[PDB]
Design a binder for this molecule. Structure first.
Ligand SMILES: COCC(=O)N[C@@](C)(C(=O)Nc1cncc2ccccc12)c1ccc(Cl)c(Cl)c1
Lengths: 305, 301
């Protein structure tokens, strides 16, 4: 029993965290094989952040301008290239702690673990979801840039995020490991605002299935709904539309609990219109949307890494 | 900015997780140096669970009855001893991945990370707190026994918990790494019930200070209170009494935010009386009590 917000074990990623220093800026880098990946804004100071020509700033840099530190060992930079918003520092040493890894771009609603680092040193791990507005509600302080988001698939680490910045509302923006931003964000100093967020519907439904698996049934009802009627109601409460893909994905949880997805939709529909009424689901007074259907299965079955 | 429930990086503890098998039972062990620590109930049979004599069952066991597996390598048991509710299996290999560590016994209200394992294999990490009733609200399935609770402070792993059992309410009971149970629990199938839980008041106040640091001030008020008047109100909502130690502990957060501890106590009384009114504090509609004053300072500086 129990349902906690659980991150993947961070050991395989901790062995990849390095400190990258370029001039006055110190952020984190991800050392995989003989390459160190980090946000390209490390080559930026104060005027280099306002209106920056990154190709122009990078051509002016030499390999010895980047001080890379793996623990107490300085890594020798032998090359530098830029792919989108990520800087790639070729080093002389291949990381012996390099795990089996992939660079994957995730979709909104998908969750991943974040290993928050400061000065190439891991300080915490947490689980969060790529919001529909492409931001992450992270916990980051100055110096966290270059902290990575990942999923662990069997023995393979799928890197899906690199932290670049904090928006004025306290939410975070970053890129996949190929330097492509998540959302309409750019890596510079300009007016950028996160779009109005929406709730990840498939994730709330998965979390309601997890509540049923844990003995919380108070919200269940005898009613069912059509997918169209549910989406008409969901749109009104700023909830993401539920597709037939989502209904299919929730199939195993529906089979395990004996509650059809559209029957669970009718419970969510009542919860949106009438509220919790002083009651809680899995210790929460709000509908949780940062557990995917796979996360629920993984935690309520016992999958290991 | 931001406030998340944050666990410590689990790498240093992952390198210590082994699988311990004794007869039909398979749970997790913690391999530190040449010793593997695990719950002593790994030696228990079917009829030897309601009233087990552990000294008697252990004297009947030999080193080859324990199959210890570190990844795909079978470790060789060369000794066995029992310290309270933990079994210590002396092995012939010192764990090369052994970090700088300590065994620390924590007090209720203290937080720690849990690395949940199944068959000596880490499946996930989460944060939780020692409840005032000495249980943890964990997420554990059968086979998670021997999973450990830890804190990491300046390169050193402080082991503070080892999972032993699930109570009938779904909450969990376990021991410190010296085998001493937290709470009035025993490692027997006897009728055991967790005492009625209470909210960790000092932790809620620390979390309200974290909300102020993050710009959330809606709950603040013009009032202050006496510690006695606060405790009289707190006990009515099943909140732990706030001691002068707690008031002292919240001093740095009080200095940083400019809100006196007893002034924040008056905010908390009002929150208890009125509720949230559709508003949230740090993305929560409930008062969070699983962040210590030390966690708040750590995360906000
Ligand atoms: C055959 O195992 C039955 C069982 O419950 N065994 C465990 C081992 C048990 O509770 N363990 C489990 C741990 N954490 C979550 C658990 C969720 C579900 C089930 C089991 C959990 C048990 C039981 C009674 C005692 Cl006194 C002790 Cl010390 C241990």
């Amino acid at each position: 029993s129990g349902f906690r917000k659980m991150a993947f074990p961070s050991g395989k990623v901790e062995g990849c965290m390095v400190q990258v220093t370029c001039g006055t800026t110190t952020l984190n880098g991800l050392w995989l094989d003989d390459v160190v990946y980090c946000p390209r804004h490390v080559i930026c100071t104060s005027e280099d952040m306002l209106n920056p020509n990154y190709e122009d700033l990078l051509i002016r840099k030499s390999n010895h301008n980047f001080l890379v530190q793996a623990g107490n060992v300085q890594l020798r930079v032998i090359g530098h290239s830029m792919q989108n918003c990520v800087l790639k520092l070729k080093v002389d040493t291949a990381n012996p702690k390099t795990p089996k890894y992939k660079f994957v771009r995730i979709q909104p609603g998908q969750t991943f673990s974040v290993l928050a680092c400061y000065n190439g040193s891991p300080s915490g791990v947490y689980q969060c979801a790529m919001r529909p507005n492409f931001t992450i509600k992270g916990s980051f302080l100055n110096g966290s840039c270059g902290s990575v988001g990942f999923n662990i698939d069997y023995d393979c680490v799928s890197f899906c995020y690199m932290h670049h910045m904090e928006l004025p509302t306290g939410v975070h923006a970053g890129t996949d490991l190929e330097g492509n931003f998540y959302g309409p964000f750019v890596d510079r100093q300009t007016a950028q605002a996160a779009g109005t967020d929406t709730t990840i519907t498939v994730n709330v439904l998965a979390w309601l299935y997890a509540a049923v698996i844990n003995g919380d049934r108070w919200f269940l009802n005898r009613f069912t709904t059509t997918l169209n009627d549910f989406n008409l109601v969901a749109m009104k409460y700023n909830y993401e539309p539920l597709t037939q893909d989502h209904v299919d994905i929730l199939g195993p949880l529906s089979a395990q609990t004996g509650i059809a997805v559209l029957d669970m939709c009718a419970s969510l529909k009542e919860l949106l219109q009438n509220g919790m009424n002083g009651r809680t689901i899995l210790g929460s007074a709000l509908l949780e949307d940062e557990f995917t259907p796979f996360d629920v299965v993984r935690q309520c079955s016992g999958v290991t890494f």
